[PDB]
């Protein structure tokens, strides 16, 4: 019973660490999506 | 409403003018009640409501008026939109 | 409270409770606020309104009054034109 607890605890910590890494990549990939989804700013650049 | 021959011709047309919100596309006047749980009372309410609609429309002299809180702002928003309408130039 | 009377041997009731309480069939008891007729000019408008309202009694008071009255007053009554007739039964009580 003690051995199974060690395996269970080791996997949950490892699995939890993987989830945080996925969220960090997801947040960065979402940020570049907004940059590559807006419109080409004409603005004052038309006369520039 | 058009083929309802138990009401007079002036009364029939006045119902359409006042209650045009309840008139279906095919000319079917629709009245609905939801007060009581027993369907006998619900039907009785509809008939009594129908009597009041006909009774007030039947009388030519029956033309009551009232002033409401929403009427005051309705008149103002109607008056304000007439300020811009006053210009009279050749249109399209 | 006389648990056993000396004439018939049944359980008597306290006449003080019935003269100033109303029992609904759901077990709830009804009473008037204390001091609703004393010194009305002194109290504010809100305070007078609060004192003129019927109130319910908590579990201990409700349980206390059930042991002070016999079983005649806990019966189901169908009065004619009773204002409290619609409050007799509880409804939509999820305990």
């Amino acid at each position: 019973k003690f051995a199974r607890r060690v395996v269970l605890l080791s996997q949950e910590m490892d699995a939890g660490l993987q989830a945080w890494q996925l969220r960090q990549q997801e947040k960065l990939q979402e940020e570049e999506g907004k940059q590559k989804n807006a419109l080409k700013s004409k603005g004052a650049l038309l006369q520039n | 409403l058009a083929s309802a021959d138990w009401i007079a011709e002036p009364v029939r047309l006045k119902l359409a003018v006042k209650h045009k919100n309840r008139i279906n596309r095919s000319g079917e006047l629709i009245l609905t009640s939801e007060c009581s749980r027993y369907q006998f009372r619900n039907l009785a309410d509809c008939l009594q409501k129908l009597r009041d609609m006909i009774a007030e429309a039947s009388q030519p002299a029956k033309e009551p008026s009232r002033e409401d809180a929403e009427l005051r702002r309705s008149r103002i928003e109607n008056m304000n939109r007439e300020r811009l309408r006053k210009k009279r130039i050749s249109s399209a | 409270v006389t648990y056993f009377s000396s004439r018939k041997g049944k359980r008597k009731t306290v006449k003080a409770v019935i003269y100033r309480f109303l029992r609904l069939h759901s077990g709830l008891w009804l009473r008037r606020k204390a001091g609703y007729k004393k010194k009305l000019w002194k109290k504010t408008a809100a305070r007078k309104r609060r004192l003129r309202e019927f109130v319910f009694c908590n579990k201990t008071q409700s349980k206390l009054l059930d042991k002070m009255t016999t079983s005649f007053w806990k019966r189901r009554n169908w009065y004619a034109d009773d204002p409290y007739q619609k409050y007799q039964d509880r409804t939509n009580l999820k305990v």
């Binding site: - | 008139i23 279906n24 596309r25 629709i30 | -």
Partner: protein
Amino acid sequence: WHPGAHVGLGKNKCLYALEEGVVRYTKEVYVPNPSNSEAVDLVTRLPQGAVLYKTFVHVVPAKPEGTFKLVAML
């Protein structure tokens, strides 16, 4: 604590929420009512570089005012 947005004030200086929502506490500036002679006098004597700050209690509404639903399709 002074009342803020969506928070009333009783005659006994108690704060009660007016709309269903989340209670929030905030430090804001204080601009007293001109009809309050004592409060406006305190503001008058303040130096030019200072502003009064007071704590406030807010209730950000959660439920919307209402929604539109189809009741009849004539």
